[PDB]
C-alpha cells in the first residue's frame, strides 16, 4: 500500500502471479511481468491486490477459486494478517467466516478456499520490494 511489491510464497518459493487471461498461480521466475502487485488498503486490515501489468484484481469466487478480475468488487477484498514468523496471510473478506485463505501449492498451482487452513506453508506470503 504505497509502492508495488512481490508476494513470495514460502511453500514452493513462487511469486503470486495474475496472468492476462485472469488465471492465478505462482512462478519461480523473478523476471515475470505479471508478478508485480500493487496493494491498496481499503480499510484497516482490508486490502486489494492488483496486477500492475494488467490492472486485474486478485479475487476468490463462491467455489473457492482464485481469479483475476478486470474490475474491483466484493470478491477482491482480502484480510491481510501479519504472522509472528514474519509472513503475512490473506483471507477472503466475503468468506472470512469460512477461513478461505489465498495459497499456492508446492507445484505453484493455486489452492482452493476450503482446502486451505492455518498451518500450511501454502498460505504464508512474504511481501518483497520490487525496487
Annotated binding-site residue? 107: no
Taken in order of first residue, the domains within the chain and their CATH numbers are: 1-131 (2.80.10.50)
Query: What is the C-alpha to C-alpha distance for residues 15 and 62, in angstroms, rounded to an integer?
Result: 24
**Using what technique was this structure determined?**
X-ray
Give which of 29, 22, 5, 6 is closest to 108, Cα–Cα. 29
Query: What is the C-alpha to C-alpha distance for residues 121 and 8, in angstroms, rounded to an integer?
Result: 11
Cell numbers that stand for 65 in this block: 477459486
Compute φ and ψ for 74, nearest 5 degrees. Answer: -50, -30
**Resolution, in Å, please?**
2.0
The count of other CB atoms within 10 Å of the CB of residue 130 is 13
Give which of 87, 88, 92 is closest to 65, Cα–Cα. 92
Amino acid at each position: 500500500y504505497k509502492k508495488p511489491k512481490l508476494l513470495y510464497c514460502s511453500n514452493g518459493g513462487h511469486f503470486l502471479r495474475i496472468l492476462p487471461d485472469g488465471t492465478v498461480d505462482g512462478t519461480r521466475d523473478r523476471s515475470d511481468q505479471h508478478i508485480q502487485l500493487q496493494l491498496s488498503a481499503e480499510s484497516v486490515g482490508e486490502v486489494y491486490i492488483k496486477s500492475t501489468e494488467t490492472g486485474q484484481y486478485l479475487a476468490m469466487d463462491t467455489a473457492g477459486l482464485l481469479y483475476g478480475s478486470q474490475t474491483p468488487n466484493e470478491e477482491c477484498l482480502f484480510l491481510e494478517r501479519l504472522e509472528e514468523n514474519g509472513y503475512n496471510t490473506y483471507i477472503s473478506k466475503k468468506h472470512a467466516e469460512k477461513n478461505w485463505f489465498v495459497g499456492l501449492k508446492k507445484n505453484g498451482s493455486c489452492k482452493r478456499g476450503p482446502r486451505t487452513h492455518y498451518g500450511q506453508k501454502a498460505i504464508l506470503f512474504l511481501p518483497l520490494p520490487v525496487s
